[PDB]
Structures are given as structure tokens and as C-alpha cells.
Amino acid sequence: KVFGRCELAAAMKRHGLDNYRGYSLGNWVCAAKFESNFNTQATNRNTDGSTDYGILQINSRWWCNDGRTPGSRNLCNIPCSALLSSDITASVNCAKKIVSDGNGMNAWVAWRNRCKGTDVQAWIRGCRL
Ligand SMILES: CC(=O)N[C@@H]1[C@@H](O)[C@H](O[C@@H]2O[C@H](CO)[C@@H](O[C@@H]3O[C@H](CO)[C@@H](O)[C@H](O)[C@H]3NC(C)=O)[C@H](O)[C@H]2NC(C)=O)[C@@H](CO)O[C@H]1O
Numbered sequence: 001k002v003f004g005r006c007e008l009a010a011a012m013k014r015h016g017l018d019n020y021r022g023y024s025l026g027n028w029v030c031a032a033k034f035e036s037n038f039n040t041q042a043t044n045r046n047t048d049g050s051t052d053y054g055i056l057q058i059n060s061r062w063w064c065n066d067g068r069t070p071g072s073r074n075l076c077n078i079p080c081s082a083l084l085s086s087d088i089t090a091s092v093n094c095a096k097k098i099v100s101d102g103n104g105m106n107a108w109v110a111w112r113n114r115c116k117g118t119d120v121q122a123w124i125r126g127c128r129l
Helices: 005-014 025-036 080-084 089-099 109-114 120-124
Strands: 043-045 051-053
Touching (some): 005 025, 005 120, 051 080
16 A cells, blocks of 8 residues: 555554654654555565565564574564564554664654654645644
8 A cells, every 4th residue: 555645644543653752643653655655565685684564664583573684583473474564563563563673763764864853744735633
């Protein structure tokens, strides 16, 4: 599924991401835009042999199990394929674990480099929330 911007904002709000650990909704929509272009089916392989999955590009070395990654911890206790669903529940629940694990949203490279410090509430402008 390729989400619309306001459509994704409303889904993330419904699943409890607005201000989760103090990160306003725009931060999450911004991260999704630059990690996956709002596409739940996005995957990208990394040099270390891990793969990133789904709308928030969650990594298989730490968070989900894809059956092919050296030393995976599977901390969200889920197969990585579950993160590609058009239902974002699994991705959101795992993201809440990630953003609580010490480094906040700095775990997402695209957020650090393209969202952090910008006016992120532009990402929810015009949306009926
Ligand atoms: C969205 C996504 O999958 N991002 C990936 C990052 O999670 C990953 O960075 C590493 O994440 C782990 C898991 O949280 C970090 O470990 C934690 O580090 C803090 C201190 O920094 C410590 O207090 C926590 O206890 C510890 N957790 C565990 C379970 O040990 C680790 O620091 C991150 N590593 C770096 C270099 O930032 C990166 C790199 O694998 O990939 C992203 O895709």
C-alpha cells in the first residue's frame, strides 16, 4: 500500500503515535516519507547483510526475524514480512519499542538527516485530524 500523507497521519494518530515519547505526529510522517516514500512494501538490503522492512524501514539485525540475518535479536518478536502489510499496526507497535530504547528517533537515519530540526508540523498541514 502506498499511503497518502494525510491518510498516514490519521492512521498513526489512531495508533497512538502523536507525541509518543514526546515526538509530535509530524516527526513520524516525515520519517515515513523519507524512509519509504509512504510505501508499506519497501525493502532495502544493507552492507552488513541485514534488511530494512516496511513504512518505517525497521532493521532485521535487531528488531524482526527474516531467516537470513547474521545474529538477529528479533526484539519485536515478529517476522519481518509482517511489517510489509497494508495494516501498519505491526510496524507502529515495533516502532514504539525502538523509540523507547535509548536514542529516540535518532535510530532512523532519514529522520536524523532530513527531519530533525526542521518544521515538521508542515507534514500534517491541511489534514483533518
Ligand atoms: C529503525 C531501525 O531499525 N533502526 C536501526 C537502529 O536501531 C540501529 O541502531 C542500533 O540500535 C540498537 C537498538 O536500540 C542500539 O542499542 C541500544 O543502544 C543504547 C545506547 O546507545 C543502549 O542503552 C541500549 O540498551 C541498546 N539496546 C540494546 C538492545 O542493546 C544501538 O545503539 C544502535 N546502534 C547505533 C550504531 O546507533 C542501526 C544500526 O544497526 O540500524 C538502524 O537501521
